[PDB]
Design a protein around this nucleic acid. Structure first.
Lengths: 190, 173, 159, 78, 205
RNA sequence: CGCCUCUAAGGUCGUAUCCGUGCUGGACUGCAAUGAUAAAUAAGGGGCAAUUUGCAUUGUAUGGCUUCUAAACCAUUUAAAGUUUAUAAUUUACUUUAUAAACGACAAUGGAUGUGAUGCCAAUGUAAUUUGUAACAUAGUAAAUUGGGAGGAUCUUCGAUCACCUGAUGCCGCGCUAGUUACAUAUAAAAGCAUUAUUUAAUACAAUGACAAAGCCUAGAAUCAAUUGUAAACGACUUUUG
RNA sequence: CGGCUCUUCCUAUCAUUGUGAAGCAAAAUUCACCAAGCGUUGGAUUGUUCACCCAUGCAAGGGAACGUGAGCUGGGUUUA
RNA sequence: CGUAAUGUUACGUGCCCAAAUUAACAACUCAUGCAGAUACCAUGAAAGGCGUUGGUUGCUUAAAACAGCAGGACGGUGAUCAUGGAAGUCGAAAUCCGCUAAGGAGUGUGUAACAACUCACCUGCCGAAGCAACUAGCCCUUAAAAUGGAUGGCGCUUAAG
RNA sequence: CAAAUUUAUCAUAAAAUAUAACUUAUAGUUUAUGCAUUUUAACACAGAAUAAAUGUUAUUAAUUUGAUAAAGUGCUGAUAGAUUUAUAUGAUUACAGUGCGUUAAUUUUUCGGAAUUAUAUAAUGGCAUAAUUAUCAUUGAUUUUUGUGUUUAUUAUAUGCACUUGUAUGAUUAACAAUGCGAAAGAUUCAGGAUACCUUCGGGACCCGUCUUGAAACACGGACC
């Protein structure tokens, strides 16, 4: 019924310097900086010179005012992703054949091999800005960490969609690397 | 057209066995008074006997909204014929005149329910205040102080210049 | 904000394309999302609805209640000093130059083709021999540095 | 618009074009009769956008389509 | 130098829906036109991309069986996609409309005098006035890259040459009229034919 | 739709499919680069012409003269986007950021901002013969020639591509505006007072044209016939001929 | 009428590619989705056309121009 | 329905093509292999859609619900029904009991039979509308043919449906 | 014709919101993030005053906004057309207008000027009754044939004689002006012309005879003279 006004106001902490210009929200914290252009979207985005950032919509239908909380959580991911970061943890479960995961310096990629006793060496590139490593002090485990949540989580699930098991019962051959705990780096733990 | 309201009054012309038949009246919404005197007869054939030829039309007079610049919500009790389908509705519109709200209802039923207008009987039309309306697209406007920034204009076509030299620019500042 | 055209009370908007084209209404109430209730007492507008297409919003917002009659609206135009403010507003000036340019009598047309021609002759003379690639040198010094000597010396002629 | 195409209503039109050969002399200016013309009047307007309707003495051959017709400012009203 | 009003209208095809520009052009060209459309890689089509890609791939399927060389030639450049729309809105099997089609030049990416010439828009074909916020649209330059036109990135490199030639001809013409604004204070005492007579147009001019 | 959710925006993996590449044809005859550039030497062809002429016609220009806009809005982004300028910070770049103002799709702007600040006009003659002659405060401007660097090429209106342009050599040292004010001089009346009429061109700017009209430069190829046999129904084709 | 020859098209998908599902452990199969690119044969009997038989085959899908007699053949049908 | 001139008329007015991209509006609809586009007429149904739009009925509600992070859900007992087997449960004649702020002889792929567990109850925070059922607009789905192809064509998506 | 909304207008009026006193609140902020200053487009349809606060109560003037209707109302600008042999066998017919016209008052710009009032007869309205006829509802109202004065208005008739470039010309089209002389033999000017074509362009446009419910028919006939 074309609602008049739908709006949402994002509180921004004391340190990071968000500055929305023409829709493009850039944001800058301790662990780096991050710009996302929301200009696919036909929305208000202005920072009323407080800490905060306001996002508004005038005369949107019912679908069009669902994107208010979408974009007001994409920015709230960014205030983590430059302050606390992201760190995924996928845990490489196997039955018989061990899973061999090799990354090096600084070799952002991975080579994931011996699955399932297969000669073929799966190699998959992590996204720009995300580093994969083998997890020290808990082995048979990976640590995918970066800044942007859509390039961390696309980089975990790139290597979760391969390794995958074909032509077998997929309820029995529970083999691969599956994400255990999607987490932030510095607060509190890892 | 635009559908102003009338009071059509009718009798049953009194054969001498019966003196002074009881005089029913209406509230007919119609484009003109020639069509208000076959909406009287359509609606009264549901209600009393006496068709035409066997009745009379006593005074049909037009009624002129009693506050044309006061601003008020009109509830319309309707019933229509859908494709499978006699239903009732209660629709609410926001206007200044009462023939202008009924005509804002005869378009809306055509848009939303395909309702070509011979299917719509109007029961009642009121001027309900506020905190008696329900109809969320009318309660949008029941709050001072309402703002809404505009985006709406005309954009001539072709123009006073078809091949323009300076780009209309939907925005400024 | 980016602050587009606020539909308020009493945001003075100038009508744009209807039968009120050119006059400055106020806005007292919003009928629906497409129509308001326009009322300019000091400018030849009785109270009536108007479609928001044919309106163009100014920057002025006078204050009266949302359900006011025409005398309260007329009282508030005067207290705001809106007539004296509007005719000196940044591009109500621009309105009256197009009104001046409008349709422009034949004597006034051909007077300006005469009056623009004469200062255009005065403006191609104040033009375009800067510091660039003279000094030094400009050989031959007698004749391709003849004319600018009167910009330079100024007296008299090379010489 | 309609108001614009009615200024020309009443006025005299011409289709002027070129030929080569006379069957005439320099009786008047000095011609091989080497420019033709076919006059006419604007009778009325046509749409809602300032088109117009004309009625020439001969008939306008059709390869004239796209070519220039001239709206003389006379028979002059204001 | 000439044209039946001006030299030719050069329409910049950037920001214009394809069929709402192809009809005002085809009407204008039957009236005696001479237009040019430049930047035909930037015209728009409404609806999302795959919806238009589908429509073109179905166009590619029409071909005469007994000879495909007779059949509908499927030109793939974004300028000769636009010419396909205009040719349908013309009678092209009469001499009147074939002469109307001969007054049409269409270019993928703005060369050769129409880069220093004058670009006009057609504000009824323009996409930002007609379509809605949250309708989807594409460009013909993306559509043509996915169907067999090889010069998408020829004419992207060709254009940023042309858009860096313009970076200095707007650096000259911005300082070269820092002097026209200078010179209009040294002829302030003209006689007085600016000081009063061009208060006919007259607060700005 | 406080959670959830592959979806609503937005990302993504991705088929023996699809579309291209590679391969085969090529608008008969489309386009681009390039090579030579005639029967010569008495005499005439061919350019280079645009200067070369009267001459004659062409197109625009219609009774100066009913025009140019080949100077402009940036590239990509976009219906709360999208804009300017200013200033303090900054660029490989109106780099990016921070405050403050401005019409926050007005009339505006849809034409003239005439977007290197336009002209039917300078000439104080503004036009079918016309031209112009001096003093007082402003103004300083377009001007022709021979040996270096930086720059310009998107299916073409002249590529031994070249226009601001190193330091050199000399002149017509010529023509000049605008303004106040003064003077000479000259053209101009188409016969009609229902001056509309062939509705035109002596005008100027660009372009061909032929008959006697001045020089600068130039000095070939193709095809047939014969030959080959990488080819061939015939053409055509690959070849060769002091 | 069939067969022979030869080309193109459909998808109502037999197989293969990419998949989802099983009462999917593997193997084998079944159900479904995107999907018409390549393929879909050699014989005995009958003029057949389907079905059947031997066999090969990873695997042996269904049809369109009544496709096709100045293409043939002339076995069926059909003049004396 | 003689032969002409002028004017005015149902079908139409984005371009083909005469006339609106209407200084006329309110809505509806996004269609990934025919979105849809004028009668007759050139087909398409039954039945669906937490796609969106409107509408009708009933409950919960400004006693604090709805959602969610936070509790229990075992048992008076394998009463019996019962051996794939019923200990909170296929079936099931039958049917009666916990506790309080608050726990189901309890629906289950089959967890051989057991366990737990958790969609009720109710103390929370939340503090504002929530819940279902129903209806008929459009779109989708249902919707599969053979030359290449047809709203007449182009093309249209704050429409040109 | 209702609308007493429009507008101003009184009456105690009680509201469905703006103006002057202000606590908190996010605040790039200030100094010691409170305040200081903003934001009010957090401002409490909160506190004080005031604001028709909705009509309630009132009456109205731009005749009471708009709509419908009527008055050669009037004016303006166009477009197309204009039979007409007024006797190759029946009035140029009547109408109307303009020019010399006894007066006398009353005014008028002051010009050959112009207006008015004064004459009889016949009506017709408006008004005041008295009759009469006959009906919606009848306190009355409407109506037919009258009558007479009271009266105040308006039309008609009373314009004869002679003359003249003023309507139907009894389907009117008629004028001013420009161009152009039908030369003794033969030019020229203007307009027109599918003569048989050719050129150019836009619209239209299937192949005839035939039998047929239906032919361009993939029905038959017809290569041409």
């Amino acid at each position: 019924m074309r609602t008049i006004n739908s709006n949402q106001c994002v509180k921004i902490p004391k340190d990071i310097k968000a500055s929305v210009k023409a829709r493009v929200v850039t944001i800058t914290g301790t662990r780096g900086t991050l710009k996302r252009s929301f200009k696919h979207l036909a929305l208000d985005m202005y920072m009323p010179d407080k800490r905060t950032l306001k996002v508004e919509k005038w005369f949107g239908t019912k679908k069009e005012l669902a994107a208010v909380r979408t974009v007001c959580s994409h920015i709230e991911n960014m205030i983590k992703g430059v302050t606390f970061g992201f760190q995924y943890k996928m845990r490489a479960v196997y039955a018989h054949f061990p899973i061999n995961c090799v990354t090096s310096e600084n070799n952002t990629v991975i080579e994931i091999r011996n699955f399932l006793g297969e000669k073929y060496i799966r190699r998959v590139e992590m996204a720009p800005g995300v580093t994969v490593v083998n997890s020290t002090a808990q082995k048979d485990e990976l640590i995918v960490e970066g800044n942007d949540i859509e390039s961390v989580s696309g980089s975990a699930a790139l290597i979760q969609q391969s390794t995958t098991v074909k032509n077998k019962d997929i309820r029995k051959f529970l083999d691969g690397l599956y994400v255990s705990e999607k987490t932030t780096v510095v607060k509190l733990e890892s | 057209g635009l559908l102003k309201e009338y009071e059509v009054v009718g009798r049953k012309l009194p054969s001498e066995k019966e003196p002074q038949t009881p005089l029913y009246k209406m509230r007919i919404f119609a484009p003109d008074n020639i069509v208000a005197k076959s909406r009287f007869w359509y609606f009264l054939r549901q209600l009393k006997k006496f068709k035409k030829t066997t009745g009379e039309i006593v005074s049909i007079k037009q009624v002129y909204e009693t506050s044309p610049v006061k601003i008020k919500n009109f509830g319309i009790w309707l019933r229509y014929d859908s494709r499978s389908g006699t239903h009732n509705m209660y629709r609410e519109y926001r206007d200044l005149t009462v023939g202008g709200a009924v005509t804002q209802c005869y378009r809306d039923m055509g848009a939303r329910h395909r309702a070509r207008a011979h299917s719509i009987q109007i029961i009642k039309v009121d001027s309900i205040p506020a905190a008696k309306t329900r109809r969320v697209h009318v309660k949008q406007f029941h709050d001072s102080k309402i703002k809404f920034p505009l985006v709406q204009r005309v954009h001539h076509k072709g123009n006073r210049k078809l091949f323009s030299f300076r780009k209309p620019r939907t925005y400024f500042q | 904000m980016p602050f587009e055209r606020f539909v308020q009370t009493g945001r003075i908007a100038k009508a744009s394309a209807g039968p009120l084209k050119g006059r400055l209404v106020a806005i007292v109430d919003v009928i629906d999302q497409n129509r308001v209730l326009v009322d300019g007492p000091l400018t030849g507008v009785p109270r009536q609805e108007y479609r928001l297409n044919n309106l163009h919003l100014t920057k002025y917002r006078i204050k009266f209640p949302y359900t006011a009659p025409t005398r309260i609206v007329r009282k508030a135009w005067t207290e705001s000093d809106l007539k004296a403010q509007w005719k000196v507003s940044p591009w109500s000036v621009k309105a009256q130059n197009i009104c001046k340019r409008s349709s422009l009598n034949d004597f006034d047309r051909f007077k300006l083709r005469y009056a623009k021609r004469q200062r255009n002759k005065l403006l191609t003379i104040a033009f375009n021999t800067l510091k660039k690639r003279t000094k030094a040198d400009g050989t031959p010094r007698v004749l391709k540095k003849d004319r600018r000597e009167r910009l330079r010396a100024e007296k008299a002629k090379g010489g | 618009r309609k108001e614009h195409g009615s200024f020309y209503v009443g006025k005299r039109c011409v289709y002027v074009y070129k030929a080569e050969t006379k069957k005439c002399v320099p009786q008047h200016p000095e011609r091989k009769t080497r420019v033709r013309a076919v006059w006419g009047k604007v009778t009325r307007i046509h749409g809602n956008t300032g088109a117009v309707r004309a009625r020439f003495n001969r008939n306008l051959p059709g390869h004239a389509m796209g070519h220039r017709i001239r709206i003389m400012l006379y028979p002059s009203r204001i | 130098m000439t044209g039946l009003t001006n030299r030719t209208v050069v329409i910049d095809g950037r920001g214009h829906l394809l069929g709402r520009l192809a009809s005002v052009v085809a009407k204008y060209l039957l009236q005696g036109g001479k237009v040019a459309v430049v930047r035909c890689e930037e015209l728009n089509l409404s609806g999302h991309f795959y919806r238009n890609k589908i429509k073109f791939l179905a166009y590619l399927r029409k071909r005469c069986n007994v000879n495909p060389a007779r059949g509908p030639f499927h030109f793939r450049a974004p300028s000769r996609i636009f010419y396909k729309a205009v040719r349908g809105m013309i009678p092209h099997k009469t001499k009147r409309g074939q002469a109307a089609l001969a007054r049409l030049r269409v270019f993928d990416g703005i060369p050769s005098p129409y880069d220093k010439r004058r670009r006009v828009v057609v504000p009824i074909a323009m996409r930002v006035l007609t379509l809605r916020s949250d309708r989807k649209y594409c460009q013909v330059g993306r559509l043509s890259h996915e169907v067999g036109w090889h010069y998408q990135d020829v004419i992207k490199s060709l254009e940023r040459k042309r858009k860096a030639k313009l970076r200095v001809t707007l650096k000259h013409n911005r300082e070269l009229k820092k002097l026209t604004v200078k010179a209009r204070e040294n002829i302030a005492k003209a006689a007085e034919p600016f000081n009063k007579i061009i208060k006919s147009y007259g607060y700005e001019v």
